[PDB]
Design a protein around this ligand. Sequence first.
Ligand code: 7Y4
Ligand code: MG
Ligand code: ZN
Length: 339
Amino acid sequence: DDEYTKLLHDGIQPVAAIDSNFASFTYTPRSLPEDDTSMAILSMLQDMNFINNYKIDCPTLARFCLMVKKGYRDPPYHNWMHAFSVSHFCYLLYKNLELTNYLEDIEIFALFISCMCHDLDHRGTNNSFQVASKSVLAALYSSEGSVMERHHFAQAIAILNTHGCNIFDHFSRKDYQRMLDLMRDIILATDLAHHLRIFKDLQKMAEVGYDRNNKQHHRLLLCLLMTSCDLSDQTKGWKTTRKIAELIYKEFFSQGDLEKAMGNRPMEMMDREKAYIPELQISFMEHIAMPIYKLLQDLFPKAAELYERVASNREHWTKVSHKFTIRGLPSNNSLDFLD
Ligand SMILES: CCc1ccc(-c2c(-c3nn(C)c4ncnc(N5CC[C@@H](N(C)C)C5)c34)cnn2C)cc1
Ligand SMILES: [Mg+2]
Ligand SMILES: [Zn+2]
């Protein structure tokens, strides 16, 4: 490809040159034209010193980036831009939060790689639709749970074992297999069921306080950080939140259409005739998003602004609620829609 040419010959742009605001929480990675994002991945890893630290071969890494990028389909939400903006938020965590005092470098490295790979080959439909619609993935995976996530992992593994893409094949067998373990745990942790299982443990962790010598704290923190990244679109301003809803509901309603055409009734939120958006968004923000970011703040006080921004985005939903009632006449002055 021609993308492959340019990445392999031009050089790794330093990070400041992408945007003077690039390492800030107020930065919106979705502003970056899709065509610059593989480059940026490279700059982020460079700026974290990983390329030098773990002695990664540059061409192999370039090839791996591109494979990961094209292993994403194009549903409205779960596409390469989602994956890039989740990896970018992992980068901010390392730059802003000083994870190094809580995590080994190999763990931080794995989180970042996992971020890029965590939704590989997503089709825009969720775990219950896979079962509900008895697909090959459910066939493969459904008896162990997390259908989509096991598929994401499996695709990551398939890219790694593609000639010239194995950015880890020079690690010791000990480090190589630690790296596969960590990616499997982290990708699996992106299922909301997983997160709901470990919630008390996370609360406990923040309650007793973080213990650097407790291996299980390392594991739990890794899971919290992955869910932080995966929800990071809710940490920017109202403009991002609104646009994120458009893309998320377009995907849910599409799946809902397909559930109706197969002869099931979709859940409310996936049904475009019943889904009432402000209320679903407010529920999501209150029950899932806010608690994840409150936990982040409990363990790294410099993460407080993330939480208040999420809270603040939930407030806007409430403020615009009323606009989903047609008062007066519709713009075209006709009750045509009513028929
Ligand atoms: C464990 C952390 C986690 C990870 C991914 C998701 C997620 C979303 C999502 N991501 N973001 C940024 C959203 N912003 C608003 N609403 C969203 N939906 C509305 C309904 C809600 N659902 C889970 C009941 C999610 C989402 C879409 N699919 N999945 C699986 C959710 C939680
Ligand atoms: Mg996912
Ligand atoms: Zn995701």
